[PDB]
Amino acid sequence: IPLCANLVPVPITNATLDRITGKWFYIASAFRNEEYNKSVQEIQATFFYFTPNKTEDTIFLREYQTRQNQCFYNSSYLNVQRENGTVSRYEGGREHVAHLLFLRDTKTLMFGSYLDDEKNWGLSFYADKPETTKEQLGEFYEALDCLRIPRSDVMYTDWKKDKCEPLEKQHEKER
Numbered sequence: 001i002p003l004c005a006n007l008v009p010v011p012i013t014n015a016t017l018d019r020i021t022g023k024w025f026y027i028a029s030a031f032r033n034e035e036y037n038k039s040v041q042e043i044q045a046t047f048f049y050f051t052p053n054k055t056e057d058t059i060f061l062r063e064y065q066t067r068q069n070q071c072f073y074n075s076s077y078l079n080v081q082r083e084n085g086t087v088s089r090y091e092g093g094r095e096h097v098a099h100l101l102f103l104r105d106t107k108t109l110m111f112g113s114y115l116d117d118e119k120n121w122g123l124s125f126y127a128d129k130p131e132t133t134k135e136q137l138g139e140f141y142e143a144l145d146c147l148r149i150p151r152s153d154v155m156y157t158d159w160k161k162d163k164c165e166p167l168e169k170q171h172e173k174e175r
């Protein structure tokens with residue numbers, strides 16, 4: 001099985017939307033795009049919820065980000081472009097598009113940014129737990145290997161640093 005196979009766009013079905021539904025933890029990312037490297041540098045932890053709306057091709061996103069030892073919560077909707085296998089988010093006068101990609105491990109997922117551009121591409125890595133196994137991490141490294149991004153360029157979260165669970169639990173009461 002060739003290295004790049006899981007870096008090819010895959011159309012998103014209802015089944016794909018079911019598979020991504022729920023809580024994910026941000027594990028790691030690496031990009032050649034400087035803007036993304038800059039934004040991500042400062043993220044210490046992040047977890048999020050996806051609630052797809054299959055009929056509107058949107059996904060409701062609730063996001064719990066830790067930067068500078070404090071909790072920033074945002075909710076918004078992503079749009080789904082099923083055929084291209086991408087999801088998009090409007091983030092300040094700009095639509096941002098990412099390819100939804102998969103690894104052998106069904107408890108992970110990744111998003112590819114600027115995948116058609118060798119000067120800007122990158123990958124972000126997510127798991128259903130804030131800790132990953134060495135198998136999950138190797139799959140991610142292999143994907144980076146395909147983009148010729150060295151492993152040493154990877155930026156990681158630190159689940160020790162999460163400042164957001166006290167907000168998530170406070171949100172659970174109301175909902």
Ligand SMILES: CC(C)N(CC[C@](C(N)=O)(c1ccccc1)c1ccccn1)C(C)C
Nearest residue numbers: 029040048087088089096097098111113124
């Ligand atoms: C700052 C933080 C929010 N970013 C993630 C952006 C991302 C992605 N490409 O993984 C996305 C961007 C644009 C369009 C879709 C998805 C996403 C994935 C899952 C959840 C939140 N957001 C960093 C790690 C780059």
